[PDB]
Amino acid sequence: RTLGEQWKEKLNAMGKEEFFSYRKEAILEVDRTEARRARREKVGGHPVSRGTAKLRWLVERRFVQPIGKVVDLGCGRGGWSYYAATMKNVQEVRGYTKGGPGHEEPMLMQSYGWNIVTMKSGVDVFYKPSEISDTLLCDIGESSPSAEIEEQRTLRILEMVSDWLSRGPKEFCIKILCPYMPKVIEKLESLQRRFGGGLVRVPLSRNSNHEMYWVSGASGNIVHAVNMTSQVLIGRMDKKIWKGPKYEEDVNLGSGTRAVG
Ligand SMILES: Nc1ncnc2c1ncn2[C@@H]1O[C@H](CSCC[C@H](N)C(=O)O)[C@@H](O)[C@H]1O
Ligand SMILES: [Cl-]
Ligand SMILES: [Cl-]
Ligand SMILES: [Cl-]
């Protein structure tokens, strides 16, 4: 089996306290306390989720550069959608998410560029015909203790996103739930040859998942990138002393309506 599969099994065998220490070991973490305390209480620029910080991390390093019409698949509360709205060359943001019981509904915010954001709930993207976009974002992937179940879920997401990518967005950022399973690596290699990009591990991701982002501004060997992530994750297991996370300031999303080019 792959190193990721080994990681997965060891993760599944962990105790409660061990698991909770491990998931944040040596990760980058946003101080969400201030943002999430404003949940029960929209112009303060506080992001709706920790997802915003992940997208900033990628954009800040030019792994993706949102432009024109942005489509955000599985937008949830809208962390990525509202971040995209603050990008210089973005003109429109369209978010889709399933919502309903047990799932996130879009949160209407008045952060900067809110006037160009529309998010629609009650949309299962596996039945949604594709549309033209300039930037395609997708953050879909339900975790499972089974790598085989995650593999199938990941292949289904990849089949679905291929339709959107064939519409010509040059900028994209797609969550790969289970990048380490053989069938997923195979599909990624064909899609990389077809659409470009590469896989990046965002250090804000918890050690409890192996998610990697397929992004347009990356390049290089997928197998190697996945393997190095597996080894780093396994390397953080069973430490003698837990050092904990490293903290960074949350994203500032500003306020009010925006002009677009
Ligand atoms: N088949 C499907 N169709 C539409 N949305 C789905 C879906 N399966 C899962 N989702 C949604 O996809 C979301 C992924 S989490 C999205 C986080 C977002 N990037 C942010 O920054 O806030 C979840 O809210 C989940 O409800
Ligand atoms: Cl899924
Ligand atoms: Cl702000
Ligand atoms: Cl403006």
Cα 256 to averaged position of ligand 4 atoms, centre (Å): 8
211 catalytically annotated = yes
The residues facing 137 across adjacent strands are: 72, 173
Ligand nearest to the CA of 43: 3
Structure tokens at 31: 């101080």
State the Rg of the chain over Cα: 18
Assess whether 139 carries a catalytic annotation: yes
Query: Is 49 known to sit in a ligand binding site?
Result: yes
Resolution of the PDB structure in angstroms: 2.2
Q: How far is CA 124 from the centre of its chain?
A: 18
User: Which helix (DSSP H) or strand (DSSP E) does residue 217 occupy?
Assistant: none
Query: Which residues, 6 or more positions from 62, have their beta carbon under 8 angstroms from its beta carbon?
Result: 217
User: Which residue among 139, 150, 171, 250 is the active-site one?
Assistant: 139
Length of the chain: 261
Which residue ranges make up each domain of the chain?
A: 1-261
What DSSP designation does 13 have?
Answer: T
Q: Is 175 a catalytic residue?
A: yes
User: Rounded CA gap, 187 and 122, in Å?
Assistant: 29
Nearest to 7 by CA among 145, 140, 142, 141: 145
Asked about 54 being catalytic, the answer comes back as yes
CB-ligand 1 contact for 125 (6 Å cutoff): yes
Cα 129 off chain centre by = 22
Does residue 207's CB lie within 6 angstroms of at least one atom of ligand 1? no
- Whether residue 244 is annotated as binding a ligand: the answer is no
Ligand-binding site membership of 97 (annotated) = yes
* 108 C-alpha to ligand 1 centroid (Å): 16
DSSP letter for each residue of 59-115: HHTTS----EEEEEET-TTSHHHHHHTTSTTEEEEEEE---STTSPPPPP--STTGG
> Is the CB of 137 inside a 6 Å radius of any atom of ligand 1?
no
Please state the CATH superfamily assignment of the domain spanning residues 1-261 in this structure.
Vaccinia Virus protein VP39 (3.40.50.150)
CA separation, residue 117 to residues 49, 75, 93, 139, 232 (Å): 16, 11, 5, 17, 37
Catalytic residue among 5, 8, 24, 54: 54
- Is the distance from the beta carbon of residue 124 to the nearest atom of ligand 1 less than 6 Å? yes
